[model samples]
Target chain A: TVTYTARVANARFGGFSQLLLLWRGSIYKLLWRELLCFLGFYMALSAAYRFVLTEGQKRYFEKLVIYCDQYASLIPVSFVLGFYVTLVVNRWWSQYLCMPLPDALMCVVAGTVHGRDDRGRLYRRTLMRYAGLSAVLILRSVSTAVFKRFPTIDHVVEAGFMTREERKKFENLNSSYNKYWVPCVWFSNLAAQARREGRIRDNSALKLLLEELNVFRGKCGMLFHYDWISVPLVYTQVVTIALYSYFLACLIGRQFLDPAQGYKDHDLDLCVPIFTLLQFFFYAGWLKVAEQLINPFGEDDDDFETNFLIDRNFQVSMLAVDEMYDDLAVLEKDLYWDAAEARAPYTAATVFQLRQPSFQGSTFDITLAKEDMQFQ
Target chain B: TVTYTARVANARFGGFSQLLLLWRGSIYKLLWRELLCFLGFYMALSAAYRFVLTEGQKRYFEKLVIYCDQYASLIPVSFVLGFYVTLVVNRWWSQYLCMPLPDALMCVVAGTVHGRDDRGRLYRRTLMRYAGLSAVLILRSVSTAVFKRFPTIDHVVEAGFMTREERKKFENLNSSYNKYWVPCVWFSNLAAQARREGRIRDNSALKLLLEELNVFRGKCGMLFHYDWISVPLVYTQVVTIALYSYFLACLIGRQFLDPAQGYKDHDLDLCVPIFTLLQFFFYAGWLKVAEQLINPFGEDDDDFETNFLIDRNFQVSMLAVDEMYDDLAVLEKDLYWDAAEARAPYTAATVFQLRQPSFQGSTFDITLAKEDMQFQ
Candidate 1:
């Protein structure tokens, strides 16, 4: 959603290093508060051990520190975080793909539903409206941004996605379930009616329309199911608890214990836990990746632009069905019509790509001995 | 591909325990050789430290073991394996989704392409054949099983996917690339010819047929790309080296030294390395998950049944277009045709599912205080 791909187009010197300084969607932006809490908590325990405790108390505290440090590596924090973040990132991209776009359906309607009359225009516009309505209904339920825009059915009606009469009929159905699919059923029934009227020219066109509608409906259903069933609560709990406990041990275990006490791996009294803080940054930063991506319909910086998507789908569907209907430029022969194999010229920047040989197959270049080639 | 979901349908005790005992596609089936090698190598190292060494040499070996044990935990094997396996599993499922099934295309051809004569039959069967042929061509390039079935273009022709004359034309187009896409072009051209002959009723019908064909072609193209572009080699190497190096460290690090020397955590002189071998099984077994899933078109037990898929698609598409053409039973009213609200009864086994309430939305159950509900 917030793309920095252009800056990372090539792997040059410091290509990713420059990206780390930005504030928007950066790990530092999400992890700064947690880092501050960790640093402060670690320092507080360090201060208590150094200045507030007596000599015997210091010895007792050092033993506790060593005990905590010895067993902290037993937690499989990295394994759980890796698997959990992968699941979240997978779901995030999947939600993005499930977004409803009416491009193909609008094209089919514009091409197949015949007539230049106002009635024909009404049929196309109404069919497209039903599709846009179904998408809006589902998005409103699943996405926080879309829900904020359309807080109630009245807002949807005010947006002209529904007529007063259609709303009346919609409400009268009285089903105790999400009615996002009701509009899709309306789309199918209406398309059938249009086919009976011969506006949809053939049964093939009607079947195609219904099939495309089902695909759109299927995406909406999947998006709804994704919102309904989250990453399992137990899985999230395991990862979160593992991270927090590791850092909890880090607070006491990672302190620079007095070198005079002589613990095995605790010779440093550097006063600041540098490597421990870096570990906190990495393990916590990885968890933040999951937190940001787990419910991508939220208002995070990298979340999907659901409201913009709703507007774009509505505007594009209307344009495709109404303004672009039965319109075409005159057909003419291209400059390369006479050429046996037409090759499009590339720009100066891209001509270098032609230097690479085309791949035939993975085994195409394998060599065979003379005897092996004779089928012996 | 080898489904065991029926065994784990409920949350009953021991739901997945039986699945672990399976041999055909179990972890043991894939990991037994590696496990055996790890066990043998580890025992050889242990025997050398214990029986094959001098008393002074045993002390030196104990020091070496302590050094190896100290650094083995630094390799981050689990972290790399987690991320690597997740990437592989994602690509594996994506490849399965891109397996070119002809169900939609065959249904469209059956409904739209009209004729009762041999010519109509030829047109329908030929269109379906083109779709099936494109899938086989791509599969031959990517899948080992499919390649064995049709090792050459002559074999393809013998199998009736291509005619001898068509093979000539196919070879005449001398493009330095894979030719899996040529059949898709032939499909579009043939559908257009059908449209010109008035067999496909309208322009919309022709467009629909071409659109469905493009979807099929897109899947073929994507499957080729997946096979072409593997998970980055550097990433795979990092995971592999970390795993092997960690286990390499484990070979010396986990040897049970004599209790008389009094090492910190190595006092126990257990004859067999029980926990060390279990770690090898888990970490190496996890790596095998990636190996088995990385190229899912191979002859692994868990790989896709590409040969069976090719046969099924050919059989089903032919059946749909040729045998099942224009065949229908008389339309009749349902049992609840006049009922205002119809409900289908559930089977006794699944009747318990009705006890749970249907999911409405995440916030549908949120409560509003009586005062908050009042207008501001």
Candidate 2:
């Protein structure tokens, strides 16, 4: 009874179960294609039916359609914009930061180049280079400010969204706050640092610096207070506010007005001014900061890693000295050997000595022997 | 002056010619995709208009609608069928054709299992295997014929495209052909071949064979004469006919009659047999023809590569003989050396000795001498 029961249980659990399992497994495998086909056919049919049923009322829901279109349009535009902004920012920032290090190092190298041993001369040359760089920076900053304050003729010519009222507002507000505030703020910070480091020392000059700092701060405050109204105008002018913001944060923050096109109008011709202004403003900002901070260690024109530079110079100089000594030592040794040789005898008396009195007799005897031995 | 003249000429050419070239290039690129998209949109809009405007009269053109649906349906079904048939045929044909060769080779191998002197046994075994295989083929043929004659019974089956009268006509015609002509034709072909080979030496057998051959010819005539009746049926059951033809040409050319319950009432379950039969028939035909001719060297049951199979078998036998000789020579050399050593005089040569080695040694010894070491 037990054996029969076990056999029946085994048959039911193993063979029957295996058959049932296979049947169940195959059901899902077969139904998957059918399910996908059904769904595809249903969706296609539904779309066809809806289009057939609804003809003229599509415009009432045009907003939804527009939203969908916008969503689709944004995909490629956003992708290109993202890449463009990233590339611009990376290039600009790298170029901007690359200057101060090389410039400062070059100043130290210039001192070495001029063969100037006096600390005063080294300092004066560094100051002159920094001043020149500063002037270039100021020129860049002024041009950028002018470009930011007054929209190019293309802006007026091509802007589609600007109404008469907005145009009036733009003209009225154009130069209310100077664009120079941005560079002034940066310059002031660098100048203060320079002064603190004792790179520049003049009591009357300090008083003028304080007055300029106050005026710059006031202008910066006014710029920010009016920034809200200006921002929208900037946004309207620039096709790429987000891109400009990202580039600025990553590349050249607060140095120039946004250099990307403000609007999508093809006729605006913003590319020329944007690219030109971006290049000028970035270089100008570096030039200005370098000029304001005459200290060579600061990241500016004619400043570099003086400590490492000096260490390298010292090392090479020591090597030169060692090489020269080694070469001279060899030359001296050769000279000494020649001199000693000149003083020494050609031959030394070792074993046998020639007898001076017997020389004549020996000569005569030799002559006779030679005459006798001639035939043999 | 020469440069200016060239520039002027170049500008004139560029102005008109470049415009023309650009227009032509743009138009050329747009051609294919534009045409396809236009056709697709036109069809969709037409379909929409038809559905919207002709709502009530849609049923009046039910046949036309069904025809259109079949046209669209056949594209995908045919594509899928084509791909599936190609894959299965390519795979199954190679395996099917090479089927016989392996069995014949296996028999040879069995006969020569002990040694290669059993040529008579090998031949006998091979003949027996061939006879067995032929008997199996004959049995299979008979069973296939019987299956074709009698409609298959299954629960909840479905068919397509035929009314009761048409279906009845189809079954009757198919069954009559199978019962009255198929067996006679098949057997007569075999008998005629046998006679040609001088296998049917008896006059009575030859006479019967000739009679069967005559009957087969008469049946073939009748079959071809009434083939026109198939034309209307072909048009009515276009999808089924095309699928069937494809299967018949490429696959086994055998008819499958399924007894579907709902089919008798003309309440066709188009999903099941209509779709499934065409699919199965497509693959079956593909496999049969592909197996028959494509990979003729294959020993698969459906294959026809006899000569190649014989050659392969001969080659394998040669290899086997070569391997056996190699083993024999090696063993012979060992035996010869052993015998020579045993017969050698002890004083004339170094004594051949078998040492009684002691097994009682440490498996691992730290103090073992390096020079006298050995490993198993």
Candidate 3:
């Protein structure tokens, strides 16, 4: 029929298509939550290390003497696996709830319509989406791997072995430590002599050979003072382990679910959801890599992605407002004004006066009739 | 001659009367320095009690506990003082400076022409001439009274024995020594037995009595914690004493010397520029009062009057604004329009141009010139 029914059907189809476009846009928006989770983990780990560990234990591990160095290095590594688990779980829960579900629903409806006509086009669009995602992931992985492999910086070696000029500058900074510095120099000389002797073949057994060096360092005001930083590092390890365990449970649940009834087989079933989930997983893994590389920012650096999320919100809200305003203006001027005085085909009066069509009858009248009627 | 000169003399006398009336009305303003002084002293005392005394010493002295009780009791007292000071200062200062001087000068010039007959009435019409003179003498007495009595509030007894219910409450409040109550009870009973045996009587021996009492209170769940209050009391005493000394010095200086002459004298000069000198004295005394009363709102019992001062300011400001508006209206209508044009013999323009009359000039012009210049 050359009636309003065709036009309504066309509009409904157009709306479904628009919803699908919005759903596609939301995948890019979900990255912000993953970044935030990374930051949260990093902060928690840093806090735990600084607050929980004692000064003696920290220095015992950090000391240049081999035994101490290995102990300090091992503490952080032991804490890493558990910490990464926490980072993933916190990120997943926040992302799952915060990402707009309505957008996904719209995408499903639009995708179904578009797929009915052009399956090849939908597949090509998905491929194009993943290409950009893969590029960012590649860049992050390369940067982290490179930084970890080449950890040495020139200043670190210079700071460790104080030159004569450096020692002079240090003394000039304060007079009270001059006695301590003298003893430190003597101890280092003694340690070199001990290494020359058959007793200290390697760094691990060097502690006994360098006992005089250690005593000299202590006398020279090189004794380490207890600090507040170790506390957070210790705490972060425990919390991170708990969080990561939870994340693993979630991952396991997803992997074991029945394919037909699982979330993966939902109405909007597509490879993009699985790809986005993997992207977050890798992002979290990269954060742990960053933490292990520096260890200064903390073990769970992947928990918070503040900057990306804020930027995405800003972009989306701006677009949403602009689209709403454009649609409102068009409806107000074109549709509202044209429809204001128009009457139904069966009505003699204005559209405002026309009675809506009844279920029993196909048409309605604008003017009142003298006879009373009832629908059968 | 019965000319315009006589009318000018009358008008000048009237101005003096109006100025006197205004001065009489201004004795209700609250001075800011006075309130600040009260608060400063009050805080100083409270802080001293809190920080200075040891727990054992505090229990013996019990300064803070006493101070708090006294402060609560004196709330009503401070309220009254604050109001009174605010009202008196506002009313007196506003009128003394704003009106009387201009009016008195006009009346003096008028009396010179009107031939001494207006002098007696003019002097009587000047409000606060005697009061201003007396303020100088009163300043010394008031300052002395303030210094001597100010710190006594700190020494007042803050006695209230703990009830059975309060003892139970104390245990809940501080659980650190919950289990020590039994030992405390036994100790107190033993001390009482020793005291009955005449083993304790003097200050040193009194330690045993205190120990016994402490133990008894501890058993009853009422162990006294006195350090909290005593430290602040010591601080209060020191500050109060220092402020009181300075106040005494100022008062003594004001009473005997012509402060303007910059020299001290033993004799009281009755005619020694009474009003002006007295004004200076009162202002200085009030300043000292303000300093002494700095912490009146503190937990210390003997703080300077604060609540009263705030209320006094509210009342005085309200009245001052009300009076100013009324005066402005009356001035606009009566003085500016009618008095300047209708009553004066010379117009404002002519008066501005006129020079002083020589000896040969007519008596009538001189008299008229003087009368026309009366408003200025």
Candidate 4:
């Protein structure tokens, strides 16, 4: 992920200003071309009003400009853009959260599945491979970056997510549906088989393994659903229209006019309308936020790093199930074991956060009426 | 759900206007008192501006009014309000979606658990009660309406959500954390007991039951998290400050200034300031959406009908696990038994929506570059 979150984690004054200097995933990078075009039109109209137009034409043009300014409110650009970006941001964040990470499932498998023998190791590794394969299959469909890396079933075999024989079996299946769920069903069957073979000692432990797998499967299903069912086409078009047309109106309306004919608030003839420029930045920047976020599976700077995630999931799952199976950290008492107040030591750099008391509850500071304290 | 979704489902022209007329759960109902107070002060200021001010004061007042109108943009009301309301709306929807419904778990229990006798009936009923009790425990803490319904452990016992003995057991084993999770522990212990008794015949079946229970538990945990951590107080205050101050500026700035002095966009003396009133409705109504939705557990008109959810969950779960155990309609299919295609008949109302072809994919219409289409 091209994450700049760490850069501005603290909400100190001017925290967002630091973010503005960033070009990668910055709104300025996405909006510069459009902003310039908008500026070009604004200046072209300004020149026309000043030098090109005759007296009668200039009078008519001023009225037209006023009309455009008044009617800009009809677009409700702020309202629509706000709601649209909100929807996209929420969806983007949720998609990240439900990414079907193998960490939790691998942890369950590593401890629960019996033996350190080759057969036991194979079972655990194959199970995790199947988990990784399911995720890869889903991500390949969702993300352009993932699909580019693994373009065909042969590449998946070459990459060790599947064997050639398994690929053959996958291709032979006669269903006209995405095969992502196939590995998940295989996972369930193998886990159940392992339980039957007594490799998994307890019913509860095996249950936990399968439960995590299904949750992993559910998240995959949710992602596929998200990829399939987009934010409604009509809704998106409505927002695009609202924002673009509002800017189009601003092209004529926000031009600095002649000060000799005293139109109120138009007395100043500043060559550049700084506030109007700022408005362009805010409104267009807001829309650009939506554009970057809408399809987070794409190769946009802020899109989900599916390639990184795939590698991480596979490597971590392997490490968890194989190398770290039944691993322990020498089981000694921690620093907090005997202490009444178990506060960890903070370095001088981090100690400033201790300036405020942690929040307890919303009602902690509320002054209740005398009657409110009494039970009904 | 004070739901008017069906009314505006099609989004016809003037669709929102029709929705605005509805009193129950409408913005008008929520905003009328606030709007009246706003307008009262607005008119009061107008009366003072026209009637009370001396000639010298009148000129000074117009300056103040013009100053307010120009500087109102300094607050960035649209930007802050847009983001804040977006945050609240997302949280509200997620809370609703993650509400712990026991329907899926109940189906698993009923279908898998081998039961027909009195003891079997007792197991199913008690399992459902345990599930319902856990939900009640959490909701009582989160929702004021639920808290009033089940004020104390005695009320829970009296209402049959808990037995007198269970409440004693619940009270005895304590932690600093909320005891809502205690019932879930009871549920786990009871389900395991049922498995040992051969009521749950297979390990895989029991696994499914436990898996569903964990999902249910996860959602309950999420609800508690949402309740505990609200939108940050600072952020809410920022938005509230921005909006209120904008309207405060509007109260003076939007005063019908002299058409005689000929201010820009102040040429006509409508006296009513119809556009300013509409702005109030739009901005305040938007904030009210966030206010009502912020804590959806409240008894607001548009808040989640969670009390109804409790009733529905308990009643449906009980019915599913008990009365519907092994109950099935006779399995016969004559209508589409031999047909290769089975398209169900649609009613006239739904047919309009079905006229468009189903969306294939976002990339379906894109023509690839000739060179790009070739395999590397």
Point out the higher-scoring one by TM-score: 1 or 2: 1
Please provide, for model 1 over B110-191, each residue's C-alpha lDDT reduced to its tens digit, 9 standing for 90 to 100: 9889899999999999999999999999999999988988999999999999988889999999999999999999999999
lDDT of 4 by residue, B23-120 (tens): 88888888989989989998998899889999888888888888888756634788788778998999999998878899988988898777889888
Task: Please name the candidate that would achieve the greatest lDDT relative to the true structure.
Answer: 1
TM-score, predicted candidate 3 vs. hidden true structure: 0.15
RMSD of each: 8.6, 48.5, 43.2, 8.7
True contacts kept of each: 0.32, 0.00, 0.00, 0.03
TM-score of every candidate relative to the true structure: 0.67, 0.18, 0.15, 0.64
State the displacement of the C-alpha of residue B182, model 4, in Å, after optimal TM-score superposition.
Answer: 15
Candidate 3 iRMS, in Å?
44.8
Model 1 in CAPRI terms: which quality?
incorrect
Model 4 segments beyond 4 Å from truth? A5-20, A49-51, A66-76, A115-117, A259-275, A323-376, B1-5, B19-323, B326-376
Q: Lowest lDDT 10-mer window, candidate 4 chain A?
A: A67-76
The true-versus-predicted C-alpha distance at residue B3 of model 3, in Å, is: 72
Model 3's CAPRI class is: incorrect
- DockQ of all models, two decimals each: 0.22, 0.00, 0.01, 0.11
DockQ computed for model 1 against the true two-chain complex using alpha carbons: 0.22
**Residue A124 displacement (Å), model 4:** 2.3
Task: Summarize candidate 1's per-residue lDDT along A67-164 as a digit string, tens digits.
Answer: 88865663478777877899899888998898888998998899887778999999999999999999999988888767766667877898899989
Writing each residue's lDDT as its tens digit, candidate 3 over B1-376 gives 0123343464564665444333211221233345345435544543553567566654433433333333222233333334444644453333222211112222221222111234322222221122121121111112222222222212111111122443354345433222223323333444344345443234334453444334323322210121011224444454444444443332222232223433324244442334423443344344334333432223233332322332343344333322222233433455546454554357886785456654674655544555677786
lDDT, candidate 4, A1-376, per-residue tens: 5678798786878868877788887778788998888888888889888899999999899888878887666346887887799999999888888788998889889988877899899889999999999998888777777776666667688899999888988998765567889999989999998899998998889889989999999999888888888889999999998887888787778777677878866788887878888888988898888788878887778788888999999999999999988777899988888998878878999899786878998879888889889997
